[PDB]
Amino acid sequence: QARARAFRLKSYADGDLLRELRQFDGGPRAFVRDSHRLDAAVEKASKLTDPTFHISQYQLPHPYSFGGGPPNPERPLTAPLISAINKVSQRTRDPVGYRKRAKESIDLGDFTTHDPDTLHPRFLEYVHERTRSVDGPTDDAMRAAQTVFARLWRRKGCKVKARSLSDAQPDNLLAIIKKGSPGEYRSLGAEDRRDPRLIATMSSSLLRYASAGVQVARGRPPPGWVDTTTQVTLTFGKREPKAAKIVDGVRQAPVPRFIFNLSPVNYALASFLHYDISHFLMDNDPTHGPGFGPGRGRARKFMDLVERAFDGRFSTPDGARLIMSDITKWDANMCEALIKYSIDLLEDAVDKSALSPEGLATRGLMYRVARRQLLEKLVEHPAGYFVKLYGCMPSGSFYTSLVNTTGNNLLVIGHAIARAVEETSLTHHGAAELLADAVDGTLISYGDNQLFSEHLFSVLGLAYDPEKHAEFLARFGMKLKVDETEVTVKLGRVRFCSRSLVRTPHGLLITRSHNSLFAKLAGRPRHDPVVDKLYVRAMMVDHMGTDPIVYAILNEIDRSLNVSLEAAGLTDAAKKVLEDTAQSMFGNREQDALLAVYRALSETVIDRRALLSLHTPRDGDHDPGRLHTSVSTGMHLFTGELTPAAQWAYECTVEKWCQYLHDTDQEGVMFD
- Between 35 and 632, CB nearer to RNA: 632
628 binds RNA (CB under 7 A): yes
Q: Please report how close the Cβ of residue 96 comes to RNA at its closest, in angstroms.
A: 27
Which of 61, 180, 196, 461 touches RNA by CB under 7 A? 180
- Between 440 and 580, CB nearer to RNA: 580
| Candidates 70-78, 192-200, 342-350, 563-571; binding stretch for RNA (CB under 7 A) | 192-200
Question: According to CB under 7 A, which residues from 82 to 121 bind RNA?
Answer: 114
556 binds RNA (CB under 7 A): no
Helix axes 95-108, 514-522, angle to 10 degrees: 50
400 binds RNA (CB under 7 A): yes
| Candidates 144-152, 170-178, 365-373, 457-465; binding stretch for RNA (CB under 7 A) | 170-178
- Between 45 and 343, CB nearer to RNA: 343
> Would you tell me how many other CB atoms lie within 10 Å of the CB of residue 357?
12
| Candidates 301-309, 417-425, 573-581, 649-657; binding stretch for RNA (CB under 7 A) | 573-581
DSSP states of 28-87: TTS----GGGGHHHHHHHTT-SSBSEEE-SEE-SS-------------TTHHHHHHHHHH
Q: Are 515 and 672 in contact (CB under 8 A)?
A: yes
Which of 51, 63, 80, 295 touches RNA by CB under 7 A? 295
d(CA 607, CA 297): 21
396 binds RNA (CB under 7 A): yes
Question: According to CB under 7 A, which residues from 50 to 79 bind RNA?
Answer: 66-69
Which of 95, 170, 223, 291 touches RNA by CB under 7 A? 291
> Would you tell me how many other CB atoms lie within 10 Å of the CB of residue 444?
26
- Between 260 and 364, CB nearer to RNA: 260
397 binds RNA (CB under 7 A): yes
Q: What is the torsional sign of CA 392, 395, 399, 405?
A: positive
- Between 119 and 460, CB nearer to RNA: 119
Question: According to CB under 7 A, which residues from 495 to 514 bind RNA?
Answer: 497-498
| Candidates 40-48, 308-316, 397-405, 472-480; binding stretch for RNA (CB under 7 A) | 397-405
Which of 539, 578, 642, 661 touches RNA by CB under 7 A? 539
Which of 51, 290, 407, 525 touches RNA by CB under 7 A? 290
**Within 13 Å and on the Cβ side, how many CA atoms surround 329?**
17
Q: How wide is the angle at C-alpha 149 spanned by C-alphas 147 and 153, nearest 5°?
A: 115
Q: Please report how close the Cβ of residue 328 comes to RNA at its closest, in angstroms.
A: 12
Q: What is the torsional sign of CA 533, 539, 544, 547?
A: negative
Q: Please report how close the Cβ of residue 113 comes to RNA at its closest, in angstroms.
A: 8
Q: How wide is the angle at C-alpha 474 spanned by C-alphas 471 and 477, nearest 5°?
A: 175
Q: Please report how close the Cβ of residue 73 comes to RNA at its closest, in angstroms.
A: 15
Question: According to CB under 7 A, which residues from 304 to 363 bind RNA?
Answer: none
d(CA 635, CA 623): 21
Which of 164, 172, 488, 583 touches RNA by CB under 7 A? 583
With CB under 7 A, what is the number of residues at the site for RNA? Answer: 73
| Candidates 72-80, 191-199, 361-369, 454-462; binding stretch for RNA (CB under 7 A) | 191-199
618 binds RNA (CB under 7 A): yes
**Within 13 Å and on the Cβ side, how many CA atoms surround 142?**
24
- Between 15 and 189, CB nearer to RNA: 189
624 binds RNA (CB under 7 A): yes
Question: According to CB under 7 A, which residues from 437 to 476 bind RNA?
Answer: 446-449
Q: Are 310 and 316 in contact (CB under 8 A)?
A: yes
Q: What pairs with residue 322 in β-bridges? A: 453, 488
Q: Whose CA is closest to 669, among 482, 443, 505, 509?
A: 509
Q: Please report how close the Cβ of residue 335 comes to RNA at its closest, in angstroms.
A: 18
Which of 58, 535, 586, 660 touches RNA by CB under 7 A? 535
- Between 359 and 396, CB nearer to RNA: 396
Q: Please report how close the Cβ of residue 131 comes to RNA at its closest, in angstroms.
A: 21
In the chain, the N- to C-terminal Cα span, in Å, equals 52
d(CA 462, CA 475): 21
- Between 290 and 477, CB nearer to RNA: 290
- Between 118 and 404, CB nearer to RNA: 404
627 binds RNA (CB under 7 A): yes
- Between 180 and 644, CB nearer to RNA: 180
Category of 391 on φ-ψ map: left (φ > 0), alpha (ψ -120 to 50) or beta: left
Q: Which of helix, strand or coil describes residue 109?
A: strand
407 binds RNA (CB under 7 A): no
Q: Are 29 and 20 in contact (CB under 8 A)?
A: no
Q: Are 142 and 412 in contact (CB under 8 A)?
A: no
404 binds RNA (CB under 7 A): yes
280 binds RNA (CB under 7 A): no
Distances (CA, A) of 69 to 73, 110, 620: 11, 15, 49
Task: Please classify residue 99 by burial: count the beta carbons closer than 10 Å to its beta carbon, then call 0-12 exposed, 13-18 middle and 19+ buried.
Answer: middle
- Interface mask (CB under 7 A) for RNA, residues 366-395, using x and -? -----------------------------x
d(CA 637, CA 646): 18
- Between 146 and 278, CB nearer to RNA: 278
268 binds RNA (CB under 7 A): no
Mapped to the 3 state alphabet, what secondary structure does 319-357 carry? CCCEEECCECCHHHHCCHHHHHHHHHHHHHCCECCCCCH
